[PDB]
Symmetry: C3
Subunit: 90 residues, 3 copies
Amino acid sequence: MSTEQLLVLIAQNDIKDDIVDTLIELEFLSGFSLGNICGFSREGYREFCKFEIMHPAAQQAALLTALALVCKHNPCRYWIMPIYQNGTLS
Amino acid sequence: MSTEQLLVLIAQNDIKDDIVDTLIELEFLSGFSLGNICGFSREGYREFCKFEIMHPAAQQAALLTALALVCKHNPCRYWIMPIYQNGTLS
Amino acid sequence: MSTEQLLVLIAQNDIKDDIVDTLIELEFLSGFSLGNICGFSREGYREFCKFEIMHPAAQQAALLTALALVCKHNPCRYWIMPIYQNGTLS
């Protein structure tokens, strides 16, 4: 397995920019992605922003505590998945 | 590793609602997400609905057998991925 | 764990077709998916095509070297994730 892992975060559309701002400032991040998804929960549903953030496992706390700040008032579901391998094809 | 795992299901647009109906009724599920994706296969291609459903590993059978019903006549590709961790940031 | 694993590839919109062409020709692949995502990096951002390709771990090299060709001039981020299980519900 890998020291890299993927953080997936289901964020409300309003804290979207605040999240982007946080991430761009984190030096241990080489980049991230974001897409629109439809989300259900308890039921009621709606539209969110889905962020995917590859990061070193060693910086997991740093990453989650940083994001936990932007969500002070807007809870965000998240999950972390293992990555076997990552890189760049060329 | 985790007792939580992610079910990813590539469903045809017509059984989309039937799937939503099944999921909302499953008590061991706290919520789910769905998005539009383009899917290829054997080649011919098209547009599907991609569901992502976090659930306890212990309820995997319950979840798949329940969904297997709605797909009686519309086969759906799926895969299950491990989750190291999940929760809610605030 | 599984001998199947998921390749996730963040491709530029211009080599999108070239990638599709490569994949459709690979016999060990039963199908793949692709969706639009917004991607950041170092920061500057933009829109990409996100491919997800389930494949046997045994054919990982074959898959990456084949794709590495289409990206000769357009680098593409990628990652490989484990799959516990996969199939088709019906």
